Write a protein that binds this ligand. Structure first.
Ligand SMILES: [Co+2]
Ligand SMILES: [Co+2]
Lengths: 620, 620
């Protein structure tokens, strides 16, 4: 009954029917993206109108279409033909992942290159990589995929151990033509295997790890109603799932006594890019927008009990559409559970003789996705004290190359002859703010050092300053770890008992942002990644920091364009977009398989409550 | 047995006996500090020589003494009389704490000040605080404590809710004289109570929290041998405990195949300072060196099972000396256990069809201390992948003041009329490095951005640069979050299989360092806190960043003086001193009792291993 419920198999079947009927679905059509639309803030419309947005590709070569259907009324609300050269190509179809290797296998230029390296073509795997936009004029308007080769000695062999450097191919996946084969030179193909399940590599497994049992004899403290509505320790929210963004959080609110107070209207990771810093032409075009170009939600893993999610787990199995409009369920794709989080508050008072100790807990909502060589875990945490946090865990197998003789300023050696090009994993968290409602503003808070002199004779004083961001043209901010810079989102019309606008403070990790030269294509295509914080006026069509069609889009889409509107954000319905990421110079320890590396951010109440919101937690 | 075992009750009684026998511990003498000394460098000496260092105070006013005794040989190695005005006063004695309130209770200037505020002296608690070094010439050479008053309405009342502003007194605790009583004017004493156990404030307690049971059916995976020697998942180390530093980690090593490889010889929190930023003369002198002045270890709490340490816990009960040289045990003062830590590594490979997932875990060694209104937890973590991490958890009750009528740039409001002056909690981790042995060096690593042009035509290249710190003169470094600055400690004579020096990378949180004006007393006394990283050449008498005697001691000792030696640190026995802390602007959510805030740092292997060290980890 909730308009925020997860899409049903039936709704997806219904979208397929509606499309078929309107002639929008046929033999050469493929659904590149399908997802339910969020309500448009105005529940006075009553009843219910579940709309779905669909990106439709044409395998023949016809122009793709963006269509919005209404499943409640069984109608097509809109259907527009897209000029991809103008607005960008559609998301890479999973069924195109095989195409690059197949087309190359019969290409004489490709075969020539493999022959010179004495590589058996039936053993050469080709990775279907996004192309981006560079100097290839003939690529505009065409759906191109690039391929890098890796040798797979046998079926269960890890091909990443055997990159074939000095060679790269470009393929038009619609016309099915290999547009180009570049061979800069032969590089020895690294010989050592990276088979982490091979006992010759692992060695005898440890027998020292004793069991750790995490159990809840009375069940979890959270309740799930309406399929995806969670209620836990004063928190209330709806767990959504979109094929592009993955787990999305809706209506995050906290029941402060009598009122259910909203905090964040919608929380999601709206983009996730992996730019490479190897200037070799074989890889210099490499930039994977895992969310925008590949769609991380579709590759979500089915999480095994005990192994991926330990303790008392409650699962959600979201349903998505396949290339033909048929619903596909991602069994056990989302984990929900609460975990102990050490000490919450503690004080042993001499004067009162009272010794007080309370334990903390966090509600966890997570999913794990696989995009080629990388695997990422997305974790959302809600704490007892009102803190909200996001954490991304990056693992998988590093993307390899050959390690140049003479070394490299842009690649690190992992094994003999094996290299790992430098890269970053940069995320964008889109936070549609609702601090006690939609009338919000953001202030940049810096610590302020003071000079010893009149009024500060001992030179011990230090303060803080807050600068309200009033217009979008002033809402593109950078980090300043040195002055403890943070950003506070408040409601200027909702004050706490001390008469101060209630608020929440965003604590960033202050990791480096996009390193690429400002004039590079990736800098223009992923401009969101060049700054730590952006603030925009809400707009239902401004969903991604990189725009709706990221694949081969020329640049400037998303945030730089939205920000150009210079709308009033001082006490308005606003959205915070936080850029955060990892900068990787892979180590030997990252080979053969990478141990988890993490990054994230969190928001803590800043005068939101009238006192500590955790005084009612029992000693237990 | 092992020269790193914890001090036993017998050794402490024996030190007392040896001091008594030597005429160094008569009736007027008090032990202000007693601790076991680490074995000397190069155990070429036959057998064990357990040495104890002692700071002896004289209650009659005679000069104190620093003494080292050999408990093994029953001898006094050295005994020197100290000139406190020059070298610093001894740490504050627990017995001197109560003296301030007692003396003030009969001082007429104090009584007059209380009468002016209509406060009953029998209800006015006085917080005995370290004095620091300011313009009071008569304090040089004397043991002074300053007092700030808080009203306690009834025995179980939290006095912190009722600060008495405009008043401060200075007391000589040896001659027992009130040297000064300053009253700048009456301020309303905040009225609301801060009784977090009062059902009137808490409201009905939650009944929603279901149990989370964490058990280990077969016991823990780590072994405790020789009282404090731990072996866990390839890690090896000794858990020591010092009254000043608290938990100290010795000989941290990792068993890589056949060889036990040293990583860190000694790890401890060598100092922690809490500077206040309110320029009011009532508090502008306020700076607590919890470790150096108070000795955090002596105030360690006895940890309760289930409350403080959940799971299968193995406790250590360290023994310390009382003021008379008699042994005193801190029952269950240290918790040791291992905890599940999510996913270690994961990858679902399309090409091979192999899906691989491994769970992580960490060894935890912690203790919690209480110094007046603050309570701090010190946590050391050892992970499966070779990562070492420290985390400080700050909770307790906020130090209060009155909230000025017309607001404040240095104090925030917590409740009506109740203020919380701005302050910081800054720690100094002393890491005596032994990366594969003692021949080590440190390099500062910065991410390097590259300009688009020749050799980087697409403007996508990015690199890194490492600068070796060769002499102590150039080893005082600051954070640079923007360029991803880290510091790598390597052994230039021990190379991995790829012929690169093995190393460990230090990742700092890059929080603001000391904010006080560089010309302030605190900037000079806590000079270590003004920079993020210092590297010194090891010396057995360079133990704390602030020197042996911090109490009422000016600048002249500690890190700035050691560094002046400008010793060779390029491939030598070196020590890394990392400054990291929290900058606090108290929020309403921090009142009446503060929820835990955290800060720390970690070190990750950087080419130390020849490949991932966790390939032998089984299913889990
Ligand atoms: Co990476
Ligand atoms: Co604090």
């Amino acid at each position: 009954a909730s308009p925020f419920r997860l899409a049903s198999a039936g709704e997806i079947s219904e979208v397929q029917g509606i499309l078929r009927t309107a002639g929008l679905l046929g033999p050469e059509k493929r659904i590149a993206y399908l997802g339910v639309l969020d309500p448009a803030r105005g529940a006075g419309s009553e009843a219910e109108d579940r709309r779905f947005r669909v990106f439709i590709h044409d395998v023949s070569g016809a122009r793709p279409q963006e269509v919005t259907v209404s499943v409640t009324n069984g109608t097509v609300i809109s259907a527009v033909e897209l000029d991809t050269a103008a607005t960008g190509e559609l998301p890479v179809l999973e069924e195109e992942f095989e195409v690059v290797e197949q087309l190359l296998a019969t290409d004489e230029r490709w075969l020539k290159a493999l022959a010179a390296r004495n590589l058996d073509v039936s053993k050469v795997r080709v990775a279907p990589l996004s192309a981006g936009v560079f100097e290839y004029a003939e690529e505009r308007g065409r759906r191109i995929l690039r391929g890098l080769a890796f040798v797979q000695d046998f079926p269960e062999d890890s091909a990443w151990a055997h990159p074939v450097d000095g060679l790269v191919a470009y393929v038009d996946v619609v016309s099915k033509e290999v547009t180009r084969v570049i061979d800069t030179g032969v590089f020895p193909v690294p010989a050592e295997h990276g088979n982490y399940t091979d006992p010759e590599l692992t060695g005898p497994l440890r027998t020292t790890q004793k069991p750790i049992s995490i159990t809840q004899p009375e069940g979890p403290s959270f309740t799930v109603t309406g399929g995806n509505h969670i209620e836990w320790e004063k928190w209330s929210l709806d767990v959504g799932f979109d094929v592009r963004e993955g787990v999305v959080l809706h209506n995050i609110a906290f029941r402060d006594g009598d009122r259910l107070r909203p905090i964040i209207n919608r929380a999601s990771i709206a983009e996730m890019v992996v730019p490479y810093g190897d200037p070799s032409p074989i890889r210099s075009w490499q930039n994977y927008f895992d969310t925008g170009e590949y769609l991380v939600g579709q590759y979500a893993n089915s999480l095994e009990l005990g192994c991926d999610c330990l303790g008392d787990i409650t699962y959600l199995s979201p349903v998505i559409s396949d290339a033909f409009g048929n619903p596909r369920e991602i069994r056990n794709g989302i984990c929900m559970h609460e975990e102990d989080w050490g000490i919450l508050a503690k004080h042993s008072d001499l004067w009162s003789g009272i010794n007080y100790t309370r334990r903390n807990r966090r509600m966890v909502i997570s999913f794990f996705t696989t995009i080629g060589n990388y695997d990422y875990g997305f974790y959302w945490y809600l704490y007892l004290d009102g803190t909200i946090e996001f954490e991304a865990k990056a693992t998988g197998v590093v993307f390899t190359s050959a390690f140049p003789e003479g070394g490299s300023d842009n690649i690190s050696q992992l094994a003999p002859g094996l290299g790992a090009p430098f890269h970053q994993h940069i995320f964008s968290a889109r936070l549609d703010m609702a601090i006690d409602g939609f009338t919000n503003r953001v202030e940049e808070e810096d610590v302020v050092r003071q000079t010893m002199g009149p009024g500060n004779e001992r030179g011990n004083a230090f303060s803080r300053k807050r600068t309200v961001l009033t217009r979008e043209s002033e809402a593109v901010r950078e980090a300043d770890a040195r002055t403890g810079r943070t950003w506070i989102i408040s409601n200027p019309e909702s004050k706490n008992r001390l008469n101060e606008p209630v608020g929440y403070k965003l604590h960033a990790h202050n990791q480096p942002t996009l390193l690429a030269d400002p004039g590079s294509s990736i800098a223009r295509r992923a401009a969101f990644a060049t700054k730590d914080l952006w603030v925009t006026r809400y707009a239902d069509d401004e969903r991604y920091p990189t725009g709706d069609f990221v694949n081969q889009h020329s640049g400037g889409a998303g945030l730089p364009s939205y920000i150009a509107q210079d709308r009033d954000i001082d006490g308005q319905d606003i959205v915070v977009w936080h850029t955060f990421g990892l900068t990787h110079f892979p180590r030997v320890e990252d080979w053969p398989i990478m141990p988890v590396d993490t990054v994230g951010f969190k928001l803590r109440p800043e005068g939101f409550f009238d006192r500590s919101p955790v005084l009612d937690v029992p000693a237990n």
